[PDB]
Amino acid sequence: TGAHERTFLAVKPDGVQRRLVGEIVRRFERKGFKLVALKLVQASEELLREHYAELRERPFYGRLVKYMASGPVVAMVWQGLDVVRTSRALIGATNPADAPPGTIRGDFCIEVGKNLIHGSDSVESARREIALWFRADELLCWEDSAGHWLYE
Amino acid sequence: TGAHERTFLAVKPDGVQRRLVGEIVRRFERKGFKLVALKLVQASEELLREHYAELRERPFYGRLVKYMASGPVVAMVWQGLDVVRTSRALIGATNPADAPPGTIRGDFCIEVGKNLIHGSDSVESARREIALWFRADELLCWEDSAGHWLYE
Amino acid sequence: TGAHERTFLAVKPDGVQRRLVGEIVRRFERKGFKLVALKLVQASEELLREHYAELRERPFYGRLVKYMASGPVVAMVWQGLDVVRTSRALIGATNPADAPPGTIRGDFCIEVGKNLIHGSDSVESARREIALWFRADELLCWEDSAGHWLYE
Amino acid sequence: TGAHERTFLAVKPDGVQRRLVGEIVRRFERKGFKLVALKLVQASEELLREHYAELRERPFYGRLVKYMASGPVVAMVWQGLDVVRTSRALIGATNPADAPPGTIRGDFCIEVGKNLIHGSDSVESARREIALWFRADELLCWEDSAGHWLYE
Amino acid sequence: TGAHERTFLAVKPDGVQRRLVGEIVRRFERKGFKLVALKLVQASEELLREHYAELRERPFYGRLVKYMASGPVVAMVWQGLDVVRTSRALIGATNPADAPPGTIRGDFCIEVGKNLIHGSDSVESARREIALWFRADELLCWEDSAGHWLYE
Amino acid sequence: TGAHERTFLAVKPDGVQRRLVGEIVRRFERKGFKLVALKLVQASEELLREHYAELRERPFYGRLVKYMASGPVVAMVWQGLDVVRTSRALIGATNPADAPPGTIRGDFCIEVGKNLIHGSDSVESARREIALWFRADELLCWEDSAGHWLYE
Ligand SMILES: Nc1ncnc2c1ncn2[C@@H]1O[C@H](COP(=O)(O)OP(=O)(O)O)[C@@H](O)[C@H]1O
Ligand SMILES: Nc1ncnc2c1ncn2[C@@H]1O[C@H](COP(=O)(O)OP(=O)(O)O)[C@@H](O)[C@H]1O
Ligand SMILES: Nc1ncnc2c1ncn2[C@@H]1O[C@H](COP(=O)(O)OP(=O)(O)O)[C@@H](O)[C@H]1O
Ligand SMILES: Nc1ncnc2c1ncn2[C@@H]1O[C@H](COP(=O)(O)OP(=O)(O)O)[C@@H](O)[C@H]1O
Ligand SMILES: Nc1ncnc2c1ncn2[C@@H]1O[C@H](COP(=O)(O)OP(=O)(O)O)[C@@H](O)[C@H]1O
Ligand SMILES: Nc1ncnc2c1ncn2[C@@H]1O[C@H](COP(=O)(O)OP(=O)(O)O)[C@@H](O)[C@H]1O
Ligand SMILES: [Mg+2]
Ligand SMILES: [Mg+2]
Ligand SMILES: [Mg+2]
Ligand SMILES: [Mg+2]
Ligand SMILES: [Mg+2]
Ligand SMILES: [Mg+2]
């Protein structure tokens, strides 16, 4: 897919509550990525248990699911070259204490449980997460007039 | 409704294309308003013709509808005291040439046909537009921890 | 006093709680005014009752005093030409609904009771307020290297 | 000329010294205007005396000319619909004390002699000033990919 | 102390003179740390010689003390989990040439002697510096309504 | 030359088209570097072939030259201690995928061909590039009043 690669990002409840949705979106916009889906949702525990299926054996799993179900999240899909890996780099390490200044977590967060945002960790994860959170008809193709200035 | 008043805002295609979605959202966030719904959509001509029903006899109606249907828009609902009138003030006059610096249109736009954003013009318009664009289950009630610092 | 005019500003508890101290300070810094005093304090009811002596007959007086005593404020003195009147303009109208975008209240606030900041309303008020909140030895004289580029 | 209208702007020495060149340029860029010329120069007294010929009888003329010749200025030409009048609005009133917050002078200046920037006051003034400061071969025609999103 | 850990920061004279006090405070605010003390002061040589006691053998010690005593500084205490180590990371390396973009020194400074800010290098250093610069009654306890969104 | 070291930077056509000229200039301004030359130009292929002489055997050379000649660039000279190496660090790695957040390319770009800006790679390169792009009389000496706060 190359430049058509996509990732799933979600602003977590702490990001909404601390009024950082615009700030986060703006960082992906200024980087050059293309927004292809967006909605504010209250995720069910059922969806979240599937979202985090791979973490089912971790001791924080129960609390992570409860937390993510506790308030609104902003679900998003972004498109562009290497968007999965690059998004992860813009977000910064899982634990904000390891995330350098300049990253979202490095600039805005302190603790692993309140780290503002989720990003898919691979192309395959993004495929799964996009399908889980969004119908095909919520993913928009639009002609991106900036593309000429971001890509050869 | 008082502090529960709501308005409908939409970032128009020019706002998406020029990468101002985050910028716009951030201005409503920093003002203190509560985001209660959000989605990126491709609006149909049918929806837009009803959205702009009051302008049906004006000669720009056709091209307004075509333009708004020509690319993705970011549909939003914001909640708070006097949110309809205050949102209109943050956005600025219809014609950007009359919108002072500090407003969205005053800072970011030049011409009336490319003026970035729609806001409801009254509480009754907001009522109609919210129902037209969003189901009840897309409008989220969340406990706003900032509310104590915005309201008495 | 001319360019030596001074005003008293205070970031109110809502400004501290919403993390807008730096934002506010930065607006006075970028304007060209000279910071001559600064401290984070918890104001007593006794001080606040005198600070707001002129409002003693108003129905919001009791609640205003209690609120301002309820949490830390950032007390400040700024110096420069016409600083009292210009600070009031940067802050915006008492009621944020009347404060245009570009002002502190217009950009960041909604309601008259949670309006972020106090500014002296006149040179006489500033005289009184500066004396009430700060000792002479908390007001600092420093050689301002920017002064040649702000003043003729 | 319509959307091909042009104005002459100059960041004055105080704007260079206070490091606000980027800030100012960014405000015209975000507004949608097209940059068609730009250079850092040290203007001669001869040029400045002609630039300000209409102010020759005013008491500040001598000091204005000397000051503008005392350091580098950033000379610019911007193009777009109503750019002369709109530029003046973004800049704000001559005397910064009358320039509201949101404008360049309202946000960044205090005194009439140190007011950061010059803008042409009319289409005829811009014609004269552009010719005086720039050769025809310093004014660049480029295909503006944003134009589709700023104009009908 | 965990989340009650505290560090001492000081904006040095160059930070005040270049008008970066707001900018610096804003970076600590947006990170989530809690401001518990703040004042603008002119530090004595006596205090500064003790502040920098560990550097007494170094060749820049005399000049460092003189410089820090030469103009106002903004003394601060910040509270939060791992605040001492994280503050140092937000500030960046001692020598700004080694401080990456995104850090305060990486974004705003060039030279080791003009590096904007001091931060305690350990919990014990912070304890000592807090006691040296502030009385107990200048350190404020306030109920932090954002804490729920920064900490588990 | 020490603090008199100079580098050549150029905002490439993508930086002009995406409206990031002010943003880029502002980063060099806030760092403390001194702007000593600036112009918007349309570079000839002849000049660009010499500019990029060392890359003549690389497969992108033809397309790089054509691209850089295809639209306006903003040519600049900046002065200060270690400005060549530090500029390169602020810009970030050639390939934006390797450029961390906080850098220009890390924040604003995706692909190596659309990476916003050129910076000299050494003191000798800067010497050559400055002479190639600018006459001696376009390089300005001005007294930098901020220098006392950037340098010891
Ligand atoms: N030790 C922990 N305690 C609490 N929450 C944790 C912990 N480790 C991870 N989490 C949370 O779970 C989320 C998912 O964990 P994981 O998938 O391993 O990391 P990532 O989100 O970086 O892919 C994290 O982003 C974080 O909010
Ligand atoms: N003369 C015009 N030509 C083109 N578009 C127009 C014209 N007048 C208004 N419009 C467009 O129609 C939209 C709706 O018009 P109106 O409802 O009167 O204004 P507003 O959006 O400020 O409530 C405007 O926001 C603008 O984009
Ligand atoms: N009607 C009101 N209800 C609640 N609080 C009010 C009301 N009017 C004023 N206040 C509060 O009292 C403060 C002081 O009032 P006043 O001195 O008249 O205004 P200002 O602060 O603009 O000088 C206001 O800034 C506001 O926070
Ligand atoms: N009384 C004054 N003292 C000092 N400088 C002044 C005075 N009046 C005007 N100036 C300066 O002269 C410039 C040109 O004056 P004028 O052309 O009337 O204003 P404008 O710049 O708004 O077109 C102003 O921008 C200001 O910098
Ligand atoms: N070689 C030097 N020349 C001048 N000043 C220096 C030098 N090295 C360090 N300093 C200054 O002394 C301060 C204290 O030194 P040190 O305690 O090592 O650094 P830090 O502030 O990073 O803990 C530095 O922040 C810097 O301003
Ligand atoms: N593989 C490539 N494909 C396309 N363009 C490239 C490639 N490698 C380099 N370039 C472009 O050519 C410019 C010059 O390359 P080079 O001089 O090696 O890098 P730098 O700009 O870091 O000094 C780069 O900045 C980039 O825009
Ligand atoms: Mg994960
Ligand atoms: Mg309307
Ligand atoms: Mg009052
Ligand atoms: Mg004039
Ligand atoms: Mg130290
Ligand atoms: Mg190179």
Author numbering:
A (entry chain A), B (entry chain D), C (entry chain E), D (entry chain F), E (entry chain B), F (entry chain C): 18 to 169
Paper text:
With regard to their common enzymatic activity, NDPKs are NTP/NDP transphosphorylases encoded by the nme genes. They catalyze the transfer of the γ-phosphate group from an NTP to an NDP via the formation of a high-energy intermediate on a catalytic histidine residue. We produced a truncated version of human NDPK isoform C (residues Thr18–Glu169, NDPK-C hereafter) and determined the 3D structure via X-ray crystallography in the absence and presence of various nucleotides. A data analysis revealed a hexameric arrangement, which is organized as three dimers, as previously reported for other functional eukaryotic NDPK variants.
